[PDB]
């Protein structure tokens, strides 16, 4: 098998999870826009890829011998008898994401979502894993689960079994731009803001004192009243002043903005999705975001389901309306195509989606 | 079934709201512009899209049997007898 299994082993005999503050992070998702905002964009973003079901290896796996249209009606239409496809994906998905791992149960003809927070993995001393253990409360035998983890690194040590999260390593940010914020805000309402200071070495006698200041203070702002010189007698003396602090100095601006530019990086989603562009810049940033970001995390999904099943899966973008192709192009594609024979001409019904047409020359290339 | 649901069942038994604040926030929406707004754009917006009726899969279901010009008229003409499409439709 592999003789360093036991040594492995014992450097990480059992799951230990990553995603600590959780109570912070869901106070954050359910207050701060801009991680709400970019991880609702991501969920949603990746529930509505399809999904293809490709050809049969011939190798033995655990989920043997299921028929093909069951297990395409099970990942594209049904995946239990009670929940259905997306709210299925969609936590799937948020698994994932935030913990960093994802389970999902099997049990002859359903897949069932598993709690990530409440999983935990236990290392086979020559084998991989030895069993899945929830809860501390139930143990699942390994080949009655499907299994997906995100990349780890952990105190130093290269991590099989455990997942990092992603969202984890966002919090320090979102406190501290919070906290410019409140500050930003609170400074206004411990201000203070004179007018006018004006002074004696005499007492003055203190009510006749505050008559006067309101009288002052209504006769001289221009919306109230009229006046304007003022003439003062007796020795009372104006004393210049100047405003001591100011909030000229709070620029934030570009600080707050690095904040949020590093929330929106975290995601990796392009600006222009947060802007809006040009034209030049909308387009190919939409395949940017869907190639680089969402592909990988289903490349990892779909590897971990074609290794449980034993079929070539791979998802499929082409019903997702934000990619599909200009209709001009396409059709100059698949003229060319069809008119030089390389192609028949019911395989370009179909890439429009088209049932094929029983004409025999439909399916016959044309040579000229 | 899933033996994990007795204990799935007691992370969370009952629902709980989310929408805390609603008086102020129904304040806020009657009162201040950039929020009307965007809102209304967002409900007008999805309104609007009409709803097709593609073909039946085998598998048995709740709403067993229902011709499909039902479906269609309920969806896209009259959700029932007193209430139009649109108002159903902004309320959802």
């Not at 299994?147 to 979102?174: E, H, M, P, W």
């Not at 104006?238 to 000229?248: D, G, H, L, T, V």
């Not at 209709?327 to 429009?352: P, Q």
């Amino acid at each position: 098998l592999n003789p360093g299994q036991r040594i492995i082993r014992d450097m990480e005999p059992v799951s230990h999870r990553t995603n600590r503050k959780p109570f912070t992070t869901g106070q954050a998702y359910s207050k701060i826009e801009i991680l709400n905002r970019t991880a609702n964009m991501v969920i949603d973003s990746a529930a509505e890829c399809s999904y293809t079901v490709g050809d049969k290896y011939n190798i033995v796996t655990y989920a043997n011998g299921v028929k093909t249209k069951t297990l395409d009606t099970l990942l594209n239409v049904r995946p239990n008898p009670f929940m259905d496809i997306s709210t299925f994906r969609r936590l799937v998905v948020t698994d994932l994401l935030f913990e960093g791992c994802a389970y999902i149960y099997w049990d002859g003809t359903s897949l069932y979502h598993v709690p990530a927070a409440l999983m935990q993995v236990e290392a086979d001393a020559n084998k991989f894993i030895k069993k899945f253990i929830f809860n501390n409360q139930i143990n699942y035998r390994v080949d009655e689960i499907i299994f997906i983890k995100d990349n780890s690194y952990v105190c130093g040590t290269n991590s099989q079994i455990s997942g990092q999260s992603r969202v984890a390593t966002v919090i320090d940010s979102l406190e501290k731009r919070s906290k410019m914020l409140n500050f930003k805000e609170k400074f206004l309402d411990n201000g203070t803001v004179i007018g006018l200071i004006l002074e004696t070495d005499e007492i003055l006698n203190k009510k006749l004192r505050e008559r006067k200041q309101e009288e002052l203070q209504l006769d001289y702002n221009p919306s109230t009243g009229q006046s304007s010189v003022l003439i003062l007698d007796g020795g009372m003396k104006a004393k210049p002043y100047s405003q001591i602090s100011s909030f000229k100095d709070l620029d934030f601006k570009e600080d707050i903005a690095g904040f949020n530019k590093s929330i929106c990086l975290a995601f990796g989603v392009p600006q222009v999705l947060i802007d809006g562009g040009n034209n030049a810049n909308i387009r190919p940033n939409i395949e940017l975001f869907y190639y680089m970001t969402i592909i990988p995390m289903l490349n990892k999904l779909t590897s971990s389901l074609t290794f449980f099943f034993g079929y070539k899966i791979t998802p499929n973008t082409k019903e997702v309306a934000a990619l599909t192709p200009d209709k001009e192009a396409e059709a100059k594609h698949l003229t060319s195509l069809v008119n030089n024979g390389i192609m028949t001409g019911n395989e370009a019904r179909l890439e429009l989606n088209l049932e094929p047409l029983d004409d025999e020359q439909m399916n016959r290339i044309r040579i000229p």
